Symmetry: C2
Subunit: 377 residues, 2 copies
């Protein structure tokens, strides 16, 4: 019987792919606690206990750290898209820094027997050293770890001296993507079936009705929405109204009006978990998160990755999708009618999506992975 | 791979002990949906998808329906404590009635492969018949099922004709209480380790501090409080005032001002999940729900059951706690200093509580139970 600690640093997509593992551990009878520094209420709403290890976290202070430690990062590495996380070390370090004091304090109080952390959260690894216990890493997308944690730690040495901690290696790394979506393996890389989680939902007095014609979903994460705004979507909706398919627009629960008068074959829909919405869908157009890519795979439908041109974090997803052939890649500004027509019509996309789905289902479930983890330690 | 439907009828204690099973199924890769008729938001806050199968549910329309089907009930059976759930058939039927149309509709749309329902939710069993699939029952306390479902169904004949359904037997019944707390077995009764669930929480910037002195938890549930009122607890606190020990008063989210000044050895505390609170407690005084009894066992501490004298559903819990010796029984009006002193000092209570805890922990976890259920079907 164990006390297990889940560590998630701030950033899009970081939290949710930990939930199934946290529940897996709880339903196996272990004590489970999550440490986060944003969206603590979101972790609670998955029925979990959460400690906010940095109530004073500030994206502005994160950038001041970077300006201090690498004055030229902003006008160099940051202007082009991430292809390797280690080169973003100075910044990931800046993100991890404000979490350190509180995480160390938490590890002292809670005395975890194990630490599970998301990839971008080196603090997870230092937490595991402070406790002297095994750490298990959780990957959200196609990003290879390589030397990122050493790079990151190099920018946190004052903090590592203060807490007398050193940098260990995780005993296992759990991928989100199936083998054929990855070209290079992680050290001690473990594969795990993706089980979509998007938050709980009161769906209504019934299940969402099955639509007259099976629809194409155009969806945008409420956090990806804040940054780029509604500007991105117009050119996609405009494209859609020139296509032989019915489209459904899932922009969360945002005011749909300032877009304008929606094309007759595009209908807006209130928020539901993505996986709920896709059971009635034939394809999906989205921003390009690894979570979504996988949730689309779970639906066995083809997809189109169309992030805004200014998203610096969409590369690794794109290559995976292109190379394996489960979908199409473009940018939000570049989407046209012909591309959407190809999404619905190019059968080789569906064949692949279905083939990968079959590949992913054969992989260990969260429940089985918990079991494998316990045995390994 | 299966679609699994969870059915919970209105009533204190009905929903929560389904959560661990729902999570267990989801983490094993299955589709999971909860059907409720009250507190749909609570089920969502455990990260699940919920359908409200009776948006117009009314405790008042319920009371009227029994006042029609059995006018003598309201002043006979309802005035003395349930010793037998079957005797309450007319009312349990009334409670299930408004859920039938919606649940039948849901089963047609969702096509579940398996139904899991809490004990007082006969509709679960009719839903399983509609689908032609196995049902598994979940018990929350010591109540024996015996002939309750047949008695309940006998009041729902018009609705069974309408939906062309018959009443099946569950293929298994999952107990909340461990063997030595039970005198009589369910047919195909299975035992399962209790893993406390009270809802997620943002605990703060740290874990609740370990207190100066070890404390006796005086607790009462938020919904339990809406029924009985906050005055039902003055006496217990007054008593505590006169005991050379320390108490922590935990009354959910409730405004606590109506109790006025508290004795210097009783301290109020904001809401956390029960299991979190009891980590540092040495004993617990509570209203007597089966969930709470089991959460106290999981803490391995002795307990005192002090329900309001007007709680008609207290009996089965009482006998289990008395007979096994894991705690003391009284009513809220009757609690005195000497009884509290006994709670803290009678070592035989701790020995038994610890003994039962060891018995419970050796039972199958919810993860292992899911696995047993799938094998059985």
């Amino acid at each position: 019987h164990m006390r297990v600690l889940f560590v998630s640093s701030p950033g899009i997509g970081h939290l949710f792919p930990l939930i199934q593992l946290a529940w897996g551990f709880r339903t196996a009878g272990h004590d489970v606690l999550i440490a986060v520094a944003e969206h603590a209420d979101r972790a609670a709403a998955a029925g979990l206990e959460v400690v906010d290890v940095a109530p004073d976290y500030s994206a502005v202070k994160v950038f001041e750290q970077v300006a201090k430690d690498n004055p030229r990062f902003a006008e160099t590495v940051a202007t082009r898209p991430a292809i390797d996380l280690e080169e973003w070390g100075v910044q990931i370090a800046a993100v991890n820094r404000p979490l350190v004091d509180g995480t160390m304090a938490l590890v002292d109080d809670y005395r975890p027997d194990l630490v599970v952390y998301e990839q971008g959260a080196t603090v997870g690894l230092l937490a595991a050293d402070r406790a002297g216990v095994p750490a298990v890493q959780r990957n959200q997308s196609a990003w290879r770890t390589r030397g990122m944690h050493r790079s990151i730690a190099s920018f946190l040495t004052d903090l590592m001296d203060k807490h007398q901690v050193s940098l260990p290696e995780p005993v296992a790394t759990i991928e989100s993507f199936p083998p054929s979506l990855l070209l290079e393996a992680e050290p001690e890389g473990w594969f795990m079936r993706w089980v979509p989680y998007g938050g709980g939902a009161v769906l209504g007095d019934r299940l969402p009705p099955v639509p007259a014609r099976p629809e194409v979903a155009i969806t945008m994460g409420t956090i990806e929405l804040q940054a780029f705004g509604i500007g991105a979507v117009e050119p996609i909706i405009a494209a859609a109204g020139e296509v032989d398919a019915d489209f459904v627009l899932a922009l969360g629960d945002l005011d749909i009006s300032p877009l304008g008068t929606l094309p007759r074959n595009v209908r807006a829909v209130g928020w539901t978990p993505l996986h709920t919405l896709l059971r009635t869908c034939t394809a999906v157009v989205h921003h390009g998160g690894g979570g979504t890519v996988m949730t689309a795979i779970d639906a066995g439908i083809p997809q189109l990755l169309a992030p805004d041109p200014r998203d610096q974090f969409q590369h690794t997803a794109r290559e995976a999708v292109s190379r394996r052939g489960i979908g199409l890649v473009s940018t939000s500004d570049k989407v046209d009618a012909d591309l959407l027509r190809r999404l619905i019509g190019d059968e080789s996309l569906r064949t692949a999506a279905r083939e990968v789905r079959e590949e992913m289902v054969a992989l260990p479930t969260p429940a089985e992975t918990v079991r494998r983890i316990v045995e390994r330690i």
